[PDB]
From a paper:
[name] is a Ca2+-permeable, nonselective, six-transmembrane tetrameric cation channel ubiquitously expressed in mammalian cells and is primarily localized to the endolysosomal membrane. [name] has been suggested to be the major calcium-releasing channel in lysosomes and is involved in multiple important cellular activities including lysosome trafficking, lipid accumulation, signaling transduction, and autophagy. Loss-of-function mutations in human [name] are the direct cause of the lysosomal storage disorder mucolipidosis type IV, a neurodegenerative disease characterized by abnormal neurodevelopment, retinal degeneration, and iron-deficiency anemia. We also determined the structures of the mouse [name] channel in the apo closed, PI(3,5)P2-bound closed, PI(3,5)P2/Tem-bound open, and mucolipin synthetic agonist 1 (ML-SA1)–bound open states.
This is consistent with the functional observation of weak [name] activation by Tem alone. Nevertheless, this apo structure has a much higher resolution than previously reported ones and therefore provides a better model for structural comparison in this study. The closed ion-conduction pore of [name] contains two constrictions along the ion pathway: One is formed by the carbonyl oxygen atoms of Gly470s at the filter region with a diagonal atom-to-atom distance of about 4.8 Å; the other is formed by the hydrophobic side chains of Ile514s with a diagonal atom-to-atom distance of about 5.7 Å and serves as the cytosolic gate of the channel.
Residue numbers in the entry:
A (entry chain B), B (entry chain A), C (entry chain D), D (entry chain C): 40 to 200, 216 to 285, 296 to 527
């Protein structure tokens, strides 16, 4: 029959050793996999942190070198308010660029033809964009504008070791002013420490943005970095990671296939013996969710390791997707560690408590999500104009989540005390809104989450 | 009789389909209403955010243009402390106003006669207010003051492209100095993006307030904006919103009326059959609270949509009331979504847990509110002089609420460590006050809220 | 006998009306008392806030007028680091004092003889204190100091509308430099609004403190204010407050005396009937704790009202003690409001839950206080040198309390990440200390408080 | 037999008095020990705080004296960005050092030969370090570097009351620039207050660090202090501490030895009477854990007191280890205070509740630690480049711990809203990561901790 086969299946690894004397291969392989994946992620994180620190420090140096009157911390408020200030900022940026070799503490090299498409072989491009026809005249509300964008460009070349000074900005119809150039440096730490030199090409963009046309022109500098190679153990270890995950995926897929075949045999033998309807959950009882998690983590690790091999060879530079894949896979394997604790009764009590509480917790989350969403919409529409924490829907959701978790509460109240929402009515509404929301979610909703978990634990302890 | 009528009534929509074969019309109509109300609120919020951002950026530009030595973040501390500083601030504001066209990054137009009532056709009014008779002499405490307010005005006209320099401030009897003028600009983003041009008239008020007579004269700039039209789908969609809510209100009112008639028939038939006293709750059992919520949300949505139509046509500019109405209605419909979850048993368990816990929670709120109020009064009276967070009763309440919810606790303690309330006694009292309050409300009151919710859940699970 | 007397006693006010038809006099009198005490405290708080605001604004103006290079917010860091800086600060303070009448926005009058004991009729005293013999010579560690303090004074008189410039500071043996003078002003708001003029005499003290002898000399300005009268309903309302509290105290004391006499009769009649030992709690069962609270609040209100009458007449100026008395009395009466809720069963359930939980809560507080104190001592001794939040024992206690209540946690961790306690060992110890403390108190101690409250509620619900 | 011996053993101190009439000696000795240890730690903390304050104030004065354009709070951002700025900072530091005697408010003495190994008898050493061969040329990626470090030194001597101006920095190959000198001062507070003079020798190090080679050269000043004696009750009290702890350790060790002998007699008598297997816990039942704690605290106190005697005599200066030992011992004795509360039933209820809950709490901590670690690794790898709170693994752990305890939540969300992780994908991942983590740990894990404690309390109350 099959009761002997279903006995060996659905049975603990410790009991599995007693029958047929099968050595635990999947058991040790998963531990080895967890070790190697954690080590690989740690090494990747360390190298990435070094690269990130180099990029950030160089960008800060660029901001102090090219932005007129720049101080640390004033990034989102750095702006120009007069025509002379804008002219001075643009001219200071270009002049500092032209005298960079003998003022800069870092060794940056000019890149010929680095100004972008609007630079035809010139290193720096000084571009101003404006509408084709502005005809803005608020004296008697006579408007006549052609929304076509005109790009006026000035070509700047560094000296071999002043046209741009004759720049006329069409202030009434101006869209933005941009400065494009590239700087090339060599990461010395790589040239000494790991003996693998890295050549960085920073693409500096300085924007004087006037798209709001509000009299305030913010100024920002952003840098894009391209890391080439100047004209191992990690690769071998990344090969070990791929092999271990491949073997783990193979074994887990084999186990899943055997489970599927066994459940098919069971469901046909039920109808053969006593015709009865197989429940959907009973079919789902033959598939081990831990193996689905294991194959998911194996696939994520393999893809992330391929992308990591591409990145380490300076061919991909897609750090975000690779980091997400590796982090998700590592999270999944460290979560899958719980399967070993499910073999011991006293840990299984707590794990089963969480498992039996989870459906009710999800149902209550669905119940309270609609109240949460209504509060989010109401707060965004009413407090959005007046409260800095309510400007966007995502910001409102973050603020309300922190409020229900007991964080940043007094600042939310105090922001509304400052200007009183420019109307006693808005202040009173904010009072009612915040007090009712915080009281409802903390004293009732959180308490009900506690009650659900306590009830699940009570059922587990006394079945 | 009526037991057949009361069976169809008071019965689930799924069961309602089986009897008489009535299609669910109110069911789908409420879903459509929720969708259209949420979409309308999102569109309104996006447009309002654009308008708010334009206003804020222009006001920041005005502050940087007209306030002498202004830096971002120093709004509530910006003040003058000497006579020369006040003169320089006033003169700088007027001079910047007079040279605005050739310094400003935005295109602002002068408004003739924009200085207000004290400007008889002049664009800028420079007004100083002082008492009729001051005779302030602290040398030997000889006071003689006439509380009549005298308004001395200077008329300033922009050049066609210096009387105000002879300004003598009566410093000993001065009340405030104000500068009134208007600037007109065109929101270019509207002129391009939505092809509907908007003409903004900012009314700038610069106040040099000396009403405290404390030697410190704060300086602030506030702007009032009037949005006209320079010389659709939203309107049609707002018509759909009104129609949907009108139909929903009609159906809900019809259902409420039928319920009232049915309960009248029931209460008369009770006395006809067996004379017994109808309980107040039993009469209240015939009215569906969900329909009261639905009609309330329908009325709020209709009023808010009418005001939104008025605002979008540049006729109302009452954004606060319209936003409050729309937000409250959207919150109400998203709360009313719960009625659908009450049809399913496993969600109904949690909803009924909250419902049966609510009366005890309100009773305990009433019990602890008096302790909370006593603490608020005591903290306001004792810690008000010394603690920045205890200056007003509303501020005290906000601080204590954040304290009981575990927020901004260390800052409250640290503010009292700084100056020690200028007396060891006040510091010791603040120690006892804060420790006792936080210990009482967190360890006992919150725990009792948890206990009440747990007890209600236990009663629901095991009736 | 006495069972009829004990029946009328120990009985609810509603039941008390049915027997003997006694009108509730104490019931309405306490409500009136709560009303009048709250109104009195609110009026007192409003007037005190006006006075505090005037004082603070004048002190800020003084700081901007007399402290060289002073900016807002730099109060605890304002210091001098060179001899020239100290000379310049002292000279700037004196020069600004001498030209105050024609630079200051407020109208301050010179006070002749206001420099204190070291000024013999002069308005300003410029005092430097130093040791009699310093002989400080770190070249070869030759010390010879006489700890006697010498006070060298310079007398400064304002002009009728430069000796101090020849000031030589004994820098090696200097203790501090102080500038004493007084300024007289009239609070104009009082001169108009309430028509009761107030004459303020600010005593300005500028300290250049060198008692640390650490090369850094902090500079601070502190002001003492004396409010005289320039050469009602509140008084009548404060008389009503005294009368109401006197009558309440009389009635409550009479009730307490009757209870004492009744318990004496009961305890003698027990021995007369059946000789048995009266329990200590049984004797304590005859005294109503609410009446003890009422007499305490009455006495506090009477004392605070007497002191308030003294203050309002400009005879006391002891605001701290009066405010503490009034606030404590108001807190006590608002707490005593609970007695009315004890008459209704559903509120009595919650109140009795808290009452029966309180002894166990206090016992657990005693149990966990010793662990808390050990953590406080350990953190003060180890993290005190390196952590700004652990400098003093009270500061350590405040930090740990906020930590267990889930506030300011990440900043505490981040302060230790910054310098790592200048030793990996201290950083590791801080890691273990903070993690163990927060885990122990939040996950175990707070949970046990919740469990105690839940158990008390369960006993109350099912006796 | 031994049932009479085991009766006197394993028995409360109050019961122990009734049998054999033994006076409680260990009982009073532990109270005396707690008192003397707390007093000793308080005295040590006060003296250490005075020393720490002197060091910190002198270091702040040094920063204001020697760092060009230094302001308070700008320590981790203080940096140079141009060659001229670096030259000016170095020259300003040396010039201020050379004119220190007539500008400084503190009395600092030059130390001849205080520049360190690179100063051969000179007081100040101005050292620049650079690679032997740099040949850095990013123009065409021609690198040729010799990682050997060359130390170029300039010798500076103070005047008896300019070579360094000819300093040429090899900017392309520069590693760092350091300035070494020593200053000697006498703590005057010690010279007066405690009449024990202290001679401080500060070793000032100014670093211009270019090891990142990123164009930004941070500047920092760090001071090492050596406290000698210029050319009691505490010692006697520290002798009392050693004697008390020695006697306590002797008595506790004697009790532990008697317990071991008694358990050996019991285990042999069991086999003599009825051969049965002694359980491991039963053997562990004979050893009092409180005595192990007492001997541990005694040893820690003795070692810390020896080191404190060494420190107070200016022979050790190892404050960290001594402070850790004393703090840990004081924490242990204040924890051991609980043993007295275990003698009383109502406190024993709560203590036993915690004790029986502890194993399940540890098991659940192990269960949730793997999920926590997976989240830590994922957040470090993905959010590390973009979030300031996720730069290091310890920082990630601290952030997540504060998040689960409801602290610094909105700032974590807002940091990701600012730049959106430079990619919508990273922002969406951070949204999912933070929401899922906070929801899982607060609503489920903390609730299960509460449930475990409640269950343990329920078992204790109803065995
Ligand atoms: C300055 O404004 C212009 C619009 O006038 C922006 O031009 C757009 O640039 C993006 C990306 O470079 C293109 O995809 C669009 O097609 C461009 N639009 C037009 C109309 O040319 C430009 O990006 C702005 N500069 C900055 C730095 O934001
Ligand atoms: C400057 O002070 C005067 C009072 O001297 C304020 O005048 C009041 O203004 C409000 C609103 O404009 C009126 O309702 C009052 O009737 C005015 N009172 C008097 C006595 O004229 C004026 O508002 C203050 N200016 C500012 C900007 O606050
Ligand atoms: C400046 O230092 C002197 C000590 O040299 C302080 O003098 C003490 O002042 C207090 C209160 O005024 C008196 O109770 C003490 O008796 C004084 N001691 C001595 C030795 O005279 C003085 O207070 C300090 N000044 C400031 C502003 O702190
Ligand atoms: C400046 O950089 C040099 C490296 O060029 C650092 O020198 C190291 O110093 C430490 C401690 O002083 C020694 O243990 C190492 O052996 C030194 N390395 C070399 C290669 O000499 C120096 O510490 C740096 N200065 C500062 C202030 O950080
Ligand atoms: Na919190």
């Amino acid at each position: 029959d099959l009761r002997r086969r279903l006995k060996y299946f659905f049975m603990s690894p410790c009991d599995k050793f007693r029958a047929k004397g099968r050595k635990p291969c999947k058991l040790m392989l998963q531990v080895v996999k967890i070790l190697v994946v954690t080590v690989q992620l740690i090494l990747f994180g360390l190298s990435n942190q070094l690269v990130v620190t180099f990029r950030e420090e160089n960008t800060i140096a660029f901001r102090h070198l090219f932005l007129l009157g720049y101080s640390d911390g004033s990034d989102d408020t750095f702006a120009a308010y007069t025509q002379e200030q804008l002219y001075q900022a643009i001219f200071y940026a270009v002049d500092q660029y032209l005298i960079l070799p003998e003022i800069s503490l870092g060794r940056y090299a000019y890149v010929r033809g680095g100004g972008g498409p609007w630079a035809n072989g010139s290193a720096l491009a000084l571009c101003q964009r404006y509408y084709h026809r502005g005809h803005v005249d608020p004296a008697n509300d006579t408007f006549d504008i052609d929304p076509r964008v005109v790009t006026d460009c000035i070509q700047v070349d560094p000296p071999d070791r002043a046209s741009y000074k004759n720049l006329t900005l069409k202030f009434h119809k101006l869209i933005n002013v941009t400065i494009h150039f590239q700087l090339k440096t060599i990461n010395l730490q790589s040239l000494i420490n790991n003996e693998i030199p890295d050549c960085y090409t920073f693409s500096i963009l300085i924007t004087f943005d006037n798209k709001a046309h509000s009299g305030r022109i913010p100024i920002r500098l952003e840098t894009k970095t391209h890391i080439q190679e100047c004209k191992s153990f990690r690769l071998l270890f990344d090969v070990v990671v791929i092999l271990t995950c491949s073997l783990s995926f193979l074994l887990c897929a084999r186990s899943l296939l055997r489970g599927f075949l066994l459940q098919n045999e069971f469901v046909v033998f039920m109808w053969r013996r006593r015709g009865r309807e197989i429940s959907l959950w009973e079919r789902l009882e033959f598939v081990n969710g831990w193996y689905i998690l294991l194959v998911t983590s194996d696939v994520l690790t393999i893809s992330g390791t391929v992308m990591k091999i591409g990145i380490e060879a300076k061919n991909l530079a897609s750090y975000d997707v690779c980091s997400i894949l590796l982090g998700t896979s590592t999270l999944l394997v460290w979560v899958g560690v719980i399967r070993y604790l499910t073999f011991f009764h006293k840990y299984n009590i707590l794990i089963a408590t969480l498992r039996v509480a989870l459906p009710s917790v999800m149902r209550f989350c669905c119940c309270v999500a609609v109240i949460y969403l209504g509060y989010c919409f109401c707060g965004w529409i009413v407090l959005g104009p007046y409260h800095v924490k309510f400007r966007s829907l995502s910001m409102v959701s973050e603020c309300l989540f922190s409020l229900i978790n007991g964080d940043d509460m007094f600042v939310t109240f105090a922001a509304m005390q400052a200007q009183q929402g420019h109307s006693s009515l808005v202040w009173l509404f904010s009072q009612l809104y915040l007090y009712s929301f915080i009281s409802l979610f903390i004293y009732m909703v959180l308490s009900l989450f506690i009650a659900l978990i306590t009830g699940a634990y009570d059922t587990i302890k006394h079945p």
